[model samples]
Each structure stands twice: as C-alpha cells, then as structure tokens.
Target: VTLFVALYDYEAITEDDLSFHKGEKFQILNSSEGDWWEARSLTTGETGYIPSNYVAPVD
Candidate 1:
C-alpha cells in the first residue's frame, strides 16, 4: 500500500465516498482508476473512494 496525505477537506456526497479532513493520512489500496482512488483512513478506520487530486503522495 502507498501512503498519501489529504490536500483539502472532503465531505462524502455518496455512500462510496470517503470523508477526510485536510492533512489527514490515508493508505492507498487501489489507484487503477483515473479520478478516484480507493483508500483507508488512518484516523477513522474507514475505507472508501477518495478524490485522487485531493491528496498528494506522502514524502
């Protein structure tokens, strides 16, 4: 799995959407898609789709 950090706060608009706060960390599960990537929230222990552009790969 790859690690990433949220660049902006995101609110879940649909059931598959993963809500995450800005600066939050996520472990990327599947990034095969273009617009969204599957991930698990480090803080919430929730797994869902998150905007790919809204997060940057962790250094």
Candidate 2:
C-alpha cells in the first residue's frame, strides 16, 4: 500500500536529512528490502532511502 501523511509523522534519520511534511505523500516502493524504502520528496527533487518504520499510512 501507499503512504499518506496525516496518520503519521516522518522524521529524518540524520540531522542533515530532510523530513516529510504533513500532507506529503510517498509510495511504498518496496518493503522486503529490510526496513528501508526509496521515496521521492515532493518538496525537493531528491530521491533516497529511508527507514520504512519512519512512515505510516495516513488515516
């Protein structure tokens, strides 16, 4: 399933990393590849890996 923002808060793994904003959206990409997933930042044109647990499906 895809992820929405209202249901959860996404935090950056590092201080220099970017966090997902409220109402922001990202696709699951993959889950079996450990707890990390590749997501695209809607605000920034950056694509990288993040811990899957860091995001949750918005309610």
Candidate 3:
C-alpha cells in the first residue's frame, strides 16, 4: 500500500496498538478492520494498529 500521513498524535492504548506522532508516515499493511488498521511506521519500522481516522491517504 501507499503511504499515509498521520493527522494527529495517537498514543497506543494496548500492546497491539502503535503510538505515532502528527506528520509521521505510515504504510497500511491491512485495512480489513473498519475503525482500526494494521500500519507500519516509516520512521520507526514498528507495526501495529492505528486509528483509521487518524491517518489520511497521501497522493
């Protein structure tokens, strides 16, 4: 998948979630879940679920 840009800072609520900062970049690994998605941080190389609403698809 293409890169998505973080719109706000998101703190991980569980071990399955990923903490990310605003303006950070991510790649969507799985979008099967409606509200949360599997994403990998481009900056940290960590993979976990992030709020789908917290990220926007980049061109």
Best by TM-score: 3
How would you encode candidate 2's per-residue C-alpha lDDT over 32-55 as one tens digit per residue? 757666777655645666666666
Check candidate 3 and list the clashing pairs. Answer: none
Choose 1 or 2, whichever is better by TM-score.
1
- What does candidate 1's lDDT look like per residue over 1-59, in tens digits? 56899999999988998999999999998897569998999999899999999999898
lDDT of 3 by residue, 1-59 (tens): 67999999999998999999999999999997579999999999999999999999998
TM-score of 2: 0.50
The lDDT leader among the candidates is 3
Ranking by TM-score: 3, 1, 2
Worst 10 residues of 3 by lDDT: 27-36
Q: What TM-score would every model get versus the actual structure?
A: 0.91, 0.50, 0.93
lDDT order, best first, reads: 3, 1, 2
Error at 16, model 1, angstroms? 0.8
